[PDB]
């Protein structure tokens, strides 16, 4: 019944049929992206109309198309031919991964480079990596992947332990031509294995860990209705899933007495980029846009009960499309559970004699994705006290290289002859805000120091200041941890009982933003990552901070183009885009498999409620 | 057996007997501080000599004394007379707090001020607060407390809802004299109650929360021997307790194969200051040194199973002295338990076909203290992967004032006419480091951005720089979040298998430090709080960042005087002092009882191990 329900297998099957009959899905066609469109702005939208947006690739070389389909009415709404040299290439197809290794295996230049290193071509795996946009004029308008090689000594060997440095190849995956093979010199292939399940490396497993049993004898406190509508401890929201963004949260609201109060209309991780900081020509082009180029939702893991998600777990199993339009279910792809979160509030009062303790809890919505060597967990948390938090968990296997004799300023040594180049992992959260409704504004809040003097005779006073961001051209902001900088999203037309506008405060981790030179290709293509906070006026088609077609786009798409419109954002329907990330100098302890590291942000109420919203939590 | 065992009731009774026999503990004497001394440097040393440090107050006005006694030998080792006008007053005694309200109730100036406000003296509670050092010459060498008034409408009423602004009194608690009563004008006493257990305010309690059951069917994975020695998942440490500092961690070491590797010799929160930022003369003197002035261990709560600590809990019940030298047990004052901590490492490899998931856990050691309106939780965490983390949790009732009719730049409004002055909560962690032994050094690590050009033609490279701090005069450092600044504690004489010095990296939260004007009294007394990191050479008598006697002491002691010695810290026995804190602009949601907010720091291994230390964790 709800317009925000997950796509069903039947809907995807109908989309396939509609495309088929319209002549848009022949044997040369591949679906590179398929997803449901959100309803357009309308606080009275009545008619059911489920629309899907489709990116159609052509393996014969014809122009790709963007198509919009109505599954309710069984019609093609629009179909546009795309000029990819202008607006960017389509996302990478899973089937194009195999093509890189297969094409190189018969290329004379590749084979000669392997022969010089005495490597059996049957043991060389090639990581197929996005190309970016650099100096190679012949690549404009062509679909290019670049390949880096790793040796697998046997079928269950971790190939990441054996990078083949000094060698990179470029491949046109449509015409199936190897355009360049670059061999800069022979590096020893690191010989130690990195097989973290080999007992010779692990040693005897510990026998010291006793079990922790987490159960809910009466079942969980949340309800799920309509497939994906959650109600939990005054919170209300819909859990969506998109093959590009992954888990998307819709309609986050809080029941304050009898009123359902909106907080966030749509929350997602709209892009994530992994730029590498090694200036070697073998890797100096390396930048993954995991969301925009690869689509993190299509690589979501099936999560195992008791291992990935522990406790009383409710699963969602989203449905996506494969490259031919068949529905594919991601079994147990989303875990949902509540967990104890320590003390919520506590006071022992000498004068009243009352001792008071309450416990906190959080609702967890999570999924995990695997993109080549890395694995990322995306966690959304809702707390009893109104706090909303996102946390990314990075693990997997670090991307490796040779460690040069004589050392390096841009690569860590992990094992003899084995290096790991410096890199970042930078996320963009897109928060379509709706604090008590759509009339919102953003203020930047800095701590203010005051000088000792008249009105401050003891030199103890300090204060704060708030600056309203009124137009998009002034809404590109940087962090300042030293002045305690935060950003408040308020509704100037909705006041609390003290006659102050209701608000939520965004707390950033204040980690470094993109480190690349401002003139670099990656700074132009990932401009969002150069600043901590952006605010735009809502528009239906401004979905991603990097634009719709990130792969091999020359730069400037997304946020810098949106912001240039310089629209009014003071008491309007606005979108907050928060950049946050990890700067990873790999350590020895990250090898051969990396313990989780985390980054995130959170939002806390700031005069949204008329008093603490957790006075009605029982002692239990 | 162990020299680091908790003090026993018998040891405290023996200290009392030794002091009595020596003529140092007659009827006019009070014990203001008593604690066990750590063994001096020297492995083995004196077989067994348990020594105690005692601060003895004299209620007749004679000079107090600092005394060291050997309980093993039954002897006074030293006893020095203190000149408090020079070196500071002793910590506040619990029995002095009651004196303030009683004395004021019979003072004609106080009664006249309350009569002017139509307040019944029987309903007026007085918060007795530390005095600091300001402009009042008559306070030098006297024990002064300052009192602020709150109305309690009935015996179970929260008096914090009803501050009596415009009024403060100063009391000599030894002479039992009211020195000054200052009345700057009548403010309305806010009338709304703040009774968070009153059903009229809470509304009906939630019935939606279903139970979460956390059990360990086979018991916990850690062992406790000798009363306070912990072994857990390769970690080894001793849990100490001191009436000033609270929980102290000793001898933190990690069992790496067959070798017990030291990491931290002693970890404690050695001071915590709460400065207020309201320039009103009624409160501009207000600064709590909860550790140095009040002694946070003295006010530790008894923690209730299933409410304060949830799961399979092991308790310690530390013993402290009362003011007469009698042992007092704090029943269930320390909770210890292990917690599931989500995913530890995870990877699904396309090439090898191996799917791998491991779960994390942490050991938790915690205690809670209550000092007037505030309640603070102190949490130490040990993780499987070698990470050590501290977290402070702040809750309780915010300190209140009137809210002035025309608004305020230094006070938040919480309720009609009710204000909450801005303040900070700032901690100092003292980490006596022992990374693989006592030969350590500290390096400051910043990210280095590189310009596009020769050797960086694509403008993608970035790097890092490490600067060794070689002498105390250069080891006073500031955070820099924009450059990703961290500090590495390494051992230059102990290398990992890659021939790099082993180390641990300190990750700060990069919150603002002390905001007061540098010329202020509080900036001089809390100089540690003005910088994020200090490094000193170890010395037995350099225990607290504020010195031994903080109460009513001007500047001149503590960290600024220690670092003036300019000692070699490059590969020496060193101590790291880390300042971290919360800047609190109270929100409506903090009233009438504050949901927990948190701050802390963590240390992560940085090439301490030769590879990941959790390869031997089983799948379960
Ligand atoms: Cu990384
Ligand atoms: Cu506070
Ligand atoms: Na909006
Ligand atoms: Na040391």
Swiss-Prot record, chains A, B:
PTM text: Topaquinone (TPQ) is generated by copper-dependent autoxidation of a specific tyrosyl residue.
Entry EC no(s): 1.4.3.21
Catalytic activity: a primary methyl amine + O2 + H2O = an aldehyde + H2O2 + NH4(+); 2-phenylethylamine + O2 + H2O = 2-phenylacetaldehyde + H2O2 + NH4(+)
KW Oxidoreductase (keyword) present: yes
UniProt: substrate binding residues: 288-299, 371-376
Disulfide-linked positions: 309-335
Pfam family, one: Cu_amine_oxid
The family this protein is said to belong to: Belongs to the copper/topaquinone oxidase family.
Task performed by this protein: Catalyzes the oxidative deamination of phenylethylamine to phenylacetaldehyde with the concomitant production of hydrogen peroxide and ammonia.
Protein name: Phenylethylamine oxidase
Organism: Arthrobacter globiformis
């Amino acid at each position: 019944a709800s317009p925000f329900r997950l796509a069903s297998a039947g809907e995807i099957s109908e989309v396939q049929g509609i495309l088929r009959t319209a002549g848009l899905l022949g044997p040369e066609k591949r679906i590179a992206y398929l997803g449901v469109l959100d309803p357009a702005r309308g606080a009275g939208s009545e008619a059911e109309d489920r629309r899907f947006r489709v990116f159609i690739h052509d393996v014969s070389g014809a122009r790709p198309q963007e198509v919009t389909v109505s599954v309710t009415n069984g019609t093609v709404i629009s179909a546009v031919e795309l000029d990819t040299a202008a607006t960017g290439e389509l996302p990478v197809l899973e089937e194009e991964f195999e093509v890189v290794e297969q094409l190189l295996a018969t290329d004379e230049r590749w084979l000669k480079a392997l022969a010089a290193r005495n490597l059996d071509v049957s043991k060389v795996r090639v990581a197929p990596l996005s190309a970016g946009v650099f100096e190679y004029a012949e690549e404009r308008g062509r679909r290019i992947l670049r390949g880096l090689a790793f040796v697998q000594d046997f079928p269950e060997d971790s190939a990441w332990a054996h990078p083949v440095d000094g060698l990179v190849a470029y491949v046109d995956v449509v015409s199936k031509e190897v355009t360049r093979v670059i061999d800069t010199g022979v590096f020893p292939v690191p010989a130690e294995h990195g097989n973290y399940t080999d007992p010779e490396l692990t040693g005897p497993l510990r026998t010291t860990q006793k079990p922790i049993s987490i159960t809910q004898p009466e079942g969980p406190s949340f309800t799920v209705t309509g497939g994906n509508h959650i109600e939990w401890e005054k919170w209300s929201l819909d859990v969506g899933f998109d093959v590009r963004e992954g888990v998307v949260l819709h309609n986050i609201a809080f029941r304050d007495g009898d009123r359902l109060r909106p907080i966030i209309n749509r929350a997602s991780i709209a892009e994530m980029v992994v730029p590498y900081g090694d200036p070697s020509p073998i890797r100096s082009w390396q930048n993954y846009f995991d969301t925009g180029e690869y689509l993190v939702g299509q690589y979501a893991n099936s999560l195992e009960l008791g291992c990935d998600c522990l406790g009383d777990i409710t699963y969602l199993s989203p449905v996506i499309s494969d490259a031919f339009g068949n529905p594919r279910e991601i079994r147990n792809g989303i875990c949902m559970h509540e967990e104890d979160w320590g003390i919520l509030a506590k006071h022992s009062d000498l004068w009243s004699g009352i001792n008071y303790t309450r416990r906190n809890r959080r609702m967890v919505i999570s999924f995990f994705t695997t993109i080549g060597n890395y694995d990322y967990g995306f966690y959304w948390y809702l707390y009893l006290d109104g706090t909303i938090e996102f946390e990314a968990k990075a693990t997997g296997v670090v991307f490796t290289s040779a460690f040069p004799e004589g050392g390096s300023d841009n690569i860590s040594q992990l094992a003899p002859g084995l290096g790991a180049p410096f890199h970042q992992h930078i996320f963009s959260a897109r928060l379509d805000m709706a604090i008590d409704g759509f009339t919102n504004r953003v203020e930047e809040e800095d701590v203010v120091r005051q000088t000792m003097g008249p009105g401050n005779e003891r030199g103890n006073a300090f204060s704060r200041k708030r600056t309203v961001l009124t137009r998009e051209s002034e809404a590109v902001r940087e962090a300042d941890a030293r002045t305690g900088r935060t950003w408040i999203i308020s509704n100037p037309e909705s006041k609390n009982r003290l006659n102050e506008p209701v608000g939520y405060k965004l707390h950033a981790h204040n980690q470094p933003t993109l480190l690349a030179d401002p003139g670099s290709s990656i700074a132009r293509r990932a401009a969002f990552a150069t600043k901590d906070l952006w605010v735009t006026r809502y528009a239906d088609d401004e979905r991603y901070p990097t634009g719709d077609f990130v792969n091999q786009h020359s730069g400037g798409a997304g946020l810098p183009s949106y912001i240039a419109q310089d629209r009014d954002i003071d008491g309007q329907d606005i979108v907050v885009w928060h950049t946050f990330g990890l700067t990873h100098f790999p350590r020895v302890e990250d090898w051969p498999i990396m313990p989780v590291d985390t980054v995130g942000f959170k939002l806390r109420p700031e005069g949204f409620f008329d008093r603490s919203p957790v006075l009605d939590v029982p002692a239990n």
